[PDB]
Amino acid sequence: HMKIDLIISADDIKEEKVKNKTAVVIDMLRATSVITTALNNGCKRVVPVLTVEEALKKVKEYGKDAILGGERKGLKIEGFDFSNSPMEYTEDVVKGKTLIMTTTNGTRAIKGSETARDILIGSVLNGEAVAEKIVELNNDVVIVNAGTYGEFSIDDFICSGYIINCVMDRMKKLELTDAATTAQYVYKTNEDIKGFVKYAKHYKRIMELGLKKDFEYCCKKDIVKLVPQYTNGEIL
Amino acid sequence: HMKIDLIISADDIKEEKVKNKTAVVIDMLRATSVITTALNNGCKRVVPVLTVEEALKKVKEYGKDAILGGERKGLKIEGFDFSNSPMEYTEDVVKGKTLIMTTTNGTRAIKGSETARDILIGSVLNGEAVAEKIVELNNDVVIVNAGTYGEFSIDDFICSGYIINCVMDRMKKLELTDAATTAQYVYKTNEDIKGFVKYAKHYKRIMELGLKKDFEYCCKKDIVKLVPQYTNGEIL
Numbered sequence: 001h002m003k004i005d006l007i008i009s010a011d012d013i014k015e016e017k018v019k020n021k022t023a024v025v026i027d028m029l030r031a032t033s034v035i036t037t038a039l040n041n042g043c044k045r046v047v048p049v050l051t052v053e054e055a056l057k058k059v060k061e062y063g064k065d066a067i068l069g070g071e072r073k074g075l076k077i078e079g080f081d082f083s084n085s086p087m088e089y090t091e092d093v094v095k096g097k098t099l100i101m102t103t104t105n106g107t108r109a110i111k112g113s114e115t116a117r118d119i120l121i122g123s124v125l126n127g128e129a130v131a132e133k134i135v136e137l138n139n140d141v142v143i144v145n146a147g148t149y150g151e152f153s154i155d156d157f158i159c160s161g162y163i164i165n166c167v168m169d170r171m172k173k174l175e176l177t178d179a180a181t182t183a184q185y186v187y188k189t190n191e192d193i194k195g196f197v198k199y200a201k202h203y204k205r206i207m208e209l210g211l212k213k214d215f216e217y218c219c220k221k222d223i224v225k226l227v228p229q230y231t232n233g234e235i236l
Numbered sequence: 237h238m239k240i241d242l243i244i245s246a247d248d249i250k251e252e253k254v255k256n257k258t259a260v261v262i263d264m265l266r267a268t269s270v271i272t273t274a275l276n277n278g279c280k281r282v283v284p285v286l287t288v289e290e291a292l293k294k295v296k297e298y299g300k301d302a303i304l305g306g307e308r309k310g311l312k313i314e315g316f317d318f319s320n321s322p323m324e325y326t327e328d329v330v331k332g333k334t335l336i337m338t339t340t341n342g343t344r345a346i347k348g349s350e351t352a353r354d355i356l357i358g359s360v361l362n363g364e365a366v367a368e369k370i371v372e373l374n375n376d377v378v379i380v381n382a383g384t385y386g387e388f389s390i391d392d393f394i395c396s397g398y399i400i401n402c403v404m405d406r407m408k409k410l411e412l413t414d415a416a417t418t419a420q421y422v423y424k425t426n427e428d429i430k431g432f433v434k435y436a437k438h439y440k441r442i443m444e445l446g447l448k449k450d451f452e453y454c455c456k457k458d459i460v461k462l463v464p465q466y467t468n469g470e471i472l
């Protein structure tokens with residue numbers, strides 16, 4: 001029986017809960033929705049980093065084809081090319097390019113999962129496809145919520161639940177931890193997702209930044225069939 | 237506005253989330269249900285410790301009036317007087333006595349909350365009274381779930397939700413973290429408590445130990461009006 005666990009934030013990752021597992025990183029509003037979208041639109045790779053300084057250094061390494069995106073406090077970073085809205089990573093803008101990004105939550109969670117056997121990037125947009133990859137990988141799972149500012153966040157949690165549910169649709173040989181069971185419960189009783197996310201503290205932040213469009217987009221189910229994977233510092 | 241947070245397990249306590257707050261420790265199956273019951277039945281004090289060796293040493297300090305209780309793996313510890321069933325701490329057995337105890341989860345969570353301004357002991361049995369003490373104390377709150385074996389546990393989580401709900405019944409000037417909001421949600425949609433706890437991994441453990449009686453008892457609401465408090469290594 002495949003085991004499924006959940007970690008509630010980037011500041012609550014412990015190696016022993018991650019190593020040798022299938023880790024699924026979630027930051028649905030908005031980092032993993034961005035990564036998922038960009039790669040689906042023909043982006044060559046995403047390189048997540050922790051600091052702006054390291055991001056500017058990484059540009060020089062990848063040459064003409066590198067672009068700078070992400071955010072601090074949800075805002076575009078001075079001197080970057082793009083922000084952290086999935087809509088701005090259109091095929092025209094990203095095809096074949098190398099996206100250097102650093103974000104408030106998502107990028108920390110990705111780096112924090114290094115010891116896993118496979119690091120998958122998950123979101124509402126590719127939830128079904130992630131569940132399918134989870135089953136294929138046939139290994140125990142930990143769903144790593146980025147949270148927001150090192151705290152449990154309802155958006156990442158319900159999205160975990162959706163994905164767990166999709167895994168369950170594909171098989172019965174499962175054992176959930178109580179954290180996973182609870183996420184799945186929250187999802188199962190709020191399938192539309194949108195409604196319940198409005199209780200997240202982070203939702204007020206998304207609203208005061210005028211990101212209603214990004215919010216509605218990131219709640220769309222199963223529009224991306226791709227499962228990005230972090231490997232040796234790169235996501236393809 | 238009073239802030240309410242939640243910590244999901246004894247292994248997830250971070251000082252900065254606890255210091256100077258009102259901390260409410262929960263291990264409803266069964267340590268905090270025991271402490272609550274024992275003190276309500278006229279027990280003089282409870283002294284929680286981390287090891288059996290430290291427990292045997294503490295007996296010598298408190299003399300004739302000391303008794304030994306708690307558990308490992310839910311079982312009575314060799315040479316102890318009582319186990320970790322609330323029913324065995326009757327008034328006849330505990331009145332005026334000093335209860336030295338060590339348990340798998342609850343006692344770790346209590347010690348882990350030392351830096352709080354006030355450490356309260358909470359359970360389903362004294363949930364309402366805890367909420368009343370929380371309001372009186374008029375300080376920000378963290379609800380510290382003991383969990384089981386360092387993991388998020390549905391029993392402690394729903395019990396947190398019940399208590400948060402009771403605080404809400406007594407006031408509107410609140411700000412919940414997403415973790416607290418989620419617990420309250422789980423409770424609010426499962427008010428009877430009993431039903432939903434049966435999904436906890438720990439429930440199977442309680443059942444295979446034949447503790448159906450303890451389980452039904454620990455799910456009883458508002459039968460104890462006392463709020464035990466941990467102060468300088470002692471609970472009164």
Ligand SMILES: O=C(O)[C@@H](O)CS(=O)(=O)O
Nearest residue numbers: 029030071073074084104
């Ligand atoms: O704090 C924020 O608003 C950011 O985390 C928003 S986002 O990660 O770009 O979605």
Ligand SMILES: O=C(O)[C@@H](O)CS(=O)(=O)O
Nearest residue numbers: 265266307309310320340
């Ligand atoms: O592992 C266990 O069964 C114990 O934690 C049970 S109890 O804490 O005595 O309720």
Ligand SMILES: [Mg+2]
Nearest residue numbers: 027146147148
């Ligand atoms: Mg997030």
Ligand SMILES: [Mg+2]
Nearest residue numbers: 263382383384
């Ligand atoms: Mg417990």
